[PDB]
């Protein structure tokens, strides 16, 4: 049925449109991160502790995206 | 030998060129516009001290 086709193209565009934000996010984050480690390497414990704490939220955004896109592709109520 | 006299010291101050990173909080222009009046004042006070 065409509903499964719509669900598939939906999941495709879903996981595609998901990570443009998170990509540039992790990018500028890590860029300023290493350029700050250049200024002060003696903070790297909580450097990582904050870096990972932001990258965890970005990866949370995009795993939300991917897992929803899979929920469409996998066992789904409307198909 | 015995008298009073002045003897110059042509001391050359070594300069550590830059700090390892050397961030700026200001722009490269504003810092010079705020620094060169300070060196002007220093040179004026030196030209009063050596004149005196």
Swiss-Prot record, chain A:
Cross-referenced Pfam families: ATP-synt_C
PROSITE patterns linked to this entry: ATPASE_C (PS00605)
A GO-annotated cellular component: proton-transporting ATP synthase complex
Extra information: In plastids the F-type ATPase is also known as CF(1)CF(0).
Membrane topology annotation: Multi-pass membrane protein
Function, as annotated: F(1)F(0) ATP synthase produces ATP from ADP in the presence of a proton or sodium gradient. F-type ATPases consist of two structural domains, F(1) containing the extramembraneous catalytic core and F(0) containing the membrane proton channel, linked together by a central stalk and a peripheral stalk. During catalysis, ATP synthesis in the catalytic domain of F(1) is coupled via a rotary mechanism of the central stalk subunits to proton translocation. Key component of the F(0) channel; it plays a direct role in translocation across the membrane. A homomeric c-ring of 14 subunits forms the central stalk rotor element with the F(1) delta and epsilon subunits.
GO biological process: proton motive force-driven ATP synthesis
Keyword annotations from UniProtKB, A to Z: ATP synthesis, CF(0), Chloroplast, Formylation, Hydrogen ion transport, Ion transport, Lipid-binding, Membrane, Plastid, Thylakoid, Transmembrane, Transmembrane helix, Transport
Marked site: Reversibly protonated during proton transport: 59
The species this protein was found in: Spinacia oleracea (Spinach)
Gene responsible for this protein: atpH
Subunit structure: F-type ATPases have 2 components, F(1) - the catalytic core - and F(0) - the membrane proton channel. F(1) has five subunits: alpha(3), beta(3), gamma(1), delta(1), epsilon(1). F(0) has four main subunits: a(1), b(1), b'(1) and c(14). The alpha and beta chains form an alternating ring which encloses part of the gamma chain. F(1) is attached to F(0) by a central stalk formed by the gamma and epsilon chains, while a peripheral stalk is formed by the delta, b and b' chains.
Localization per record: Plastid, Chloroplast thylakoid membrane
HAMAP family in the record: ATP_synth_c_bact (MF_01396)
Molecular function GO labels: lipid binding; proton-transporting ATP synthase activity, rotational mechanism
SUPFAM superfamilies to which the protein is assigned, alphabetical: F1F0 ATP synthase subunit C (SSF81333)
Record field: transmembrane: 1-21, 55-75
Domain of life: Eukaryota
Protein name: ATP synthase subunit c, chloroplastic
Taxonomic lineage: Eukaryota, Viridiplantae, Streptophyta, Embryophyta, Tracheophyta
Family statement: Belongs to the ATPase C chain family.
UniProtKB/Swiss-Prot annotation, chain B:
SUBUNIT field: F-type ATPases have 2 components, CF(1) - the catalytic core - and CF(0) - the membrane proton channel. CF(1) has five subunits: alpha(3), beta(3), gamma(1), delta(1), epsilon(1). CF(0) has four main subunits: a, b, b' and c.
Bilayer-spanning residue ranges: none
Family (UniProt): Belongs to the ATPase gamma chain family.
Highest taxon in the source lineage: Eukaryota
Protein localization: Plastid, Chloroplast thylakoid membrane
UniProt function note: Produces ATP from ADP in the presence of a proton gradient across the membrane. The gamma chain is believed to be important in regulating ATPase activity and the flow of protons through the CF(0) complex.
Protein name, UniProt field: ATP synthase gamma chain, chloroplastic
UniProt organism field: Spinacia oleracea (Spinach)
Included range, full protein: 261 to 312 of 364
Modifications after synthesis and translation: Activation can be brought about by a ferredoxin-dependent reduction of the disulfide bond in the light.
């Amino acid at each position: 049925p065409l509903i499964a086709a719509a669900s598939v193209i939906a999941a495709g565009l879903a996981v595609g449109l998901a990570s443009i934000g998170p990509g540039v996010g992790q990018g500028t984050a890590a860029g300023q991160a290493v350029e700050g480690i250049a200024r002060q390497p003696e903070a790297e414990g909580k450097i990582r502790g904050t870096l990972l704490l932001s990258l965890a939220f970005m990866e949370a955004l995009t795993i939300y995206g991917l897992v929803v896109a899979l929920a469409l592709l996998f066992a789904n109520p409307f198909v | 030998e015995g008298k009073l006299t002045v003897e110059r010291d042509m001391i050359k101050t070594e300069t550590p060129a830059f700090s390892p990173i050397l961030e700026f909080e200001q722009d490269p222009a504003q810092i010079l516009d705020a620094l060169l009046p300070l060196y002007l004042n220093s040179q004026i006070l030196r030209a009063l001290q050596e004149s005196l």
